[PDB]
Amino acid sequence: LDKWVCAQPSSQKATNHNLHITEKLEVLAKAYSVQGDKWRALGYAKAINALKSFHKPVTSYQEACSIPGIGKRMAEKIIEILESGHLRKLDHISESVPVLELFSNIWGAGTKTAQMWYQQGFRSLEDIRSQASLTTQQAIGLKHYSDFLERMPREEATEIEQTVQKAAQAFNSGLLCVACGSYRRGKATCGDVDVLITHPDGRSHRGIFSRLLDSLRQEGFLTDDLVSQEENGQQQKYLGVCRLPGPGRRHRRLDIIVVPYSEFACALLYFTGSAHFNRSMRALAKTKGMSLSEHALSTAVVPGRVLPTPTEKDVFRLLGLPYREPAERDW
DNA sequence: CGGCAG
DNA sequence: CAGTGC
DNA sequence: GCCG
DNA sequence: TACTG
Ligand SMILES: O=c1ccn([C@H]2C[C@H](O)[C@@H](COP(=O)(O)NP(=O)(O)OP(=O)(O)O)O2)c(=O)[nH]1
Ligand SMILES: [Cl-]
Ligand SMILES: [Cl-]
Ligand SMILES: [Cl-]
Ligand SMILES: [Cl-]
Ligand SMILES: [Mg+2]
Ligand SMILES: [Mg+2]
Ligand code: NA
Ligand code: NA
Numbered sequence: 001l002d003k004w005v006c007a008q009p010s011s012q013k014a015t016n017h018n019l020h021i022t023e024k025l026e027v028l029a030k031a032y033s034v035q036g037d038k039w040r041a042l043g044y045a046k047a048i049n050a051l052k053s054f055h056k057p058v059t060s061y062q063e064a065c066s067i068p069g070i071g072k073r074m075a076e077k078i079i080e081i082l083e084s085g086h087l088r089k090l091d092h093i094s095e096s097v098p099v100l101e102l103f104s105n106i107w108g109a110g111t112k113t114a115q116m117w118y119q120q121g122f123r124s125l126e127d128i129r130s131q132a133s134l135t136t137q138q139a140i141g142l143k144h145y146s147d148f149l150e151r152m153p154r155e156e157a158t159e160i161e162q163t164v165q166k167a168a169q170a171f172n173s174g175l176l177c178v179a180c181g182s183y184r185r186g187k188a189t190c191g192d193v194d195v196l197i198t199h200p201d202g203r204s205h206r207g208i209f210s211r212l213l214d215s216l217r218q219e220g221f222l223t224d225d226l227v228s229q230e231e232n233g234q235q236q237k238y239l240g241v242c243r244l245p246g247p248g249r250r251h252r253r254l255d256i257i258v259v260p261y262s263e264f265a266c267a268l269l270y271f272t273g274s275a276h277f278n279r280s281m282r283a284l285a286k287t288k289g290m291s292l293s294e295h296a297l298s299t300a301v302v303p304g305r306v307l308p309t310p311t312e313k314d315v316f317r318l319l320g321l322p323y324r325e326p327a328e329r330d331w
Numbered sequence: 332c333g334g335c336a337g
Numbered sequence: 338c339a340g341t342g343c
Numbered sequence: 344g345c346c347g
Numbered sequence: 348t349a350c351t352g
Contacts, residue, residue, distance in 0.1 A: 039334085039335060039344070039345090040345095043345045046344080046346095069345060069346085071345055071346085073344065073345090074344070107341095107342080111340095111341095112340060112341090113340080135352085227342085227350055229350065236348095236349070236350095237349065239343075273343090278336070278337085279335085283334095283335075283336065286336080287347095293336085293348070
């Protein structure tokens, strides 16, 4: 369990004894990510968490290699920074990376789109606005480019959650609404608000998006939709943009999912995160012949068995993990 | 050598 | 499906 | 990038 | 893992 971040409190990272190392590695990791080398970036992300949580300053090649998530190549970089204070590869990152970062921060444009735009000769958001072909989503992303990069005070996330909850409970008073993501992990600021909705009777959650969305639109609260499949009635999620009433308010990202009560624990676990916490826990489940989704914990296929998970604590227990409160899942 | 969450 | 984001 |  | 196109 030394080797599984989901087995450890994320508060281990609050005493990073290797900042001069991890601040340099983070630059490389972001360069690989925006260029599309996702697996190399993932290795970097895991090495950075390992270094942030290590109990002391790493001082030797041998000590570094012993750390899970750190191998020979990462160790060599560590000892280059220890000895010289610098990491030479930082001076040799593709010059396209700033522009690729600029472009892939458009919601709906990832690395493939950003690289295409870069190859077409675009270098600024002015170039994108006037010359790029944009999807409906990307055009909304561009319109809200600064908004979507800003994080809101958690107090504002509460007001957003309460807006959604009151609209939902107006037409069914038994609905349960919970803000998840970084809000539930206790962060001071939130990139968006992640609202989970269910009904304890097991069945009244069905067909509420149409009524909820109409209610939120009648108020003027929703200002743009990113993902909202409203035509076939099987809608699990809404992704969009809202703005609280009155002066001094910014457009804020809002994600909503509705789930049947029988799946509450796994959905709450998924939506609280963090993302790397989830991937660790899911990877841990797989090694044990299980599978963890936002819907259920189940055994491996042939159709597997669905394991009983009435609360989040049961998922931890079934994977042999000590329980972590949301604030300790912030990997 | 291949996965790396689902 | 590939690409994208949660 | 790292891991088994 | 659920959307788009
Ligand atoms: O790749 C992902 C992204 C998110 N998730 C889950 C965990 C995450 O906390 C939750 C909400 O996604 P967000 O993008 O909103 N991330 P988070 O709320 O943790 O941080 P913030 O919204 O403040 O950036 O969905 C994943 O499982 N995998
Ligand atoms: Cl009612
Ligand atoms: Cl892990
Ligand atoms: Cl079995
Ligand atoms: Cl629970
Ligand atoms: Mg969030
Ligand atoms: Mg979100
Ligand atoms: Na190691
Ligand atoms: Na993007």
